[PDB]
Amino acid sequence: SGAIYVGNYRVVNRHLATHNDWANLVWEDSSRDLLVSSTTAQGCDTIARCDCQTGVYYCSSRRKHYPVSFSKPSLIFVEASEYYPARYQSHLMLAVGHSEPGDCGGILRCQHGVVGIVSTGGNGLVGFADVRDLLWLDEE
Ligand SMILES: CNC(=O)[C@@H](c1cccc(C)c1)N1C[C@@H](C(N)=O)CC1=O
Ligand SMILES: [Zn+2]
């Protein structure tokens, strides 16, 4: 589990969104595994606006932050899970690192701010849904 809290927005994995998220919906995209809802209080996270390929992510199944090198956002085939059939997920970045399904939501960050959240993994890989192209998260 986990979210990004930027401005009056809450960014979560679409497959983990709550009823309150759907009832206060700003934007969602199944192909990216992302959903954004509105919040009453202002958050403290800032979004990175960069092309970093190194950063650090939080892994809840280890209670640890790990440094990682990650690929550029791309269209990657992801195997079937209880949340989606096997399909292509867009704007996804892969790295070598530990992950388990409940690690989704952990933040990946670089020197500039939040880059994205854990969305996929297994077999010593972890995939992150990028948010750096969502420029509207910085306004409203
Ligand atoms: C092949 N299955 C997975 O990659 C697991 C998973 C497996 C291990 C670790 C993590 C973080 C997620 N996914 C991917 C998610 C998605 N975005 O489609 C839904 C899900 O359950
Ligand atoms: Zn950066």
Swiss-Prot record:
UniProt: Zn(2+) 1 binding residues: C50, C52, C110, H112
Coiled-coil regions listed: none
Disulfide-linked positions: none
Catalytic activity line of the entry: Selective cleavage of Tyr-|-Gly bond in the picornavirus polyprotein
Record: active site: H15, D33, C104
Record text on subunit structure and interactions: Homodimer.
Functional description taken from the UniProt entry: Cysteine protease that cleaves viral polyprotein and specific host proteins. It is responsible for the autocatalytic cleavage between the P1 and P2 regions, which is the first cleavage occurring in the polyprotein. Also cleaves the host translation initiation factor EIF4G1, in order to shut down the capped cellular mRNA translation. Inhibits the host nucleus-cytoplasm protein and RNA trafficking by cleaving host members of the nuclear pores. Counteracts stress granule formation probably by antagonizing its assembly or promoting its dissassembly.
UniProt protein name: Protease 2A
Organism: Coxsackievirus A16 (strain G-10)
Full protein: residues contained: 869 to 1008 of 2193
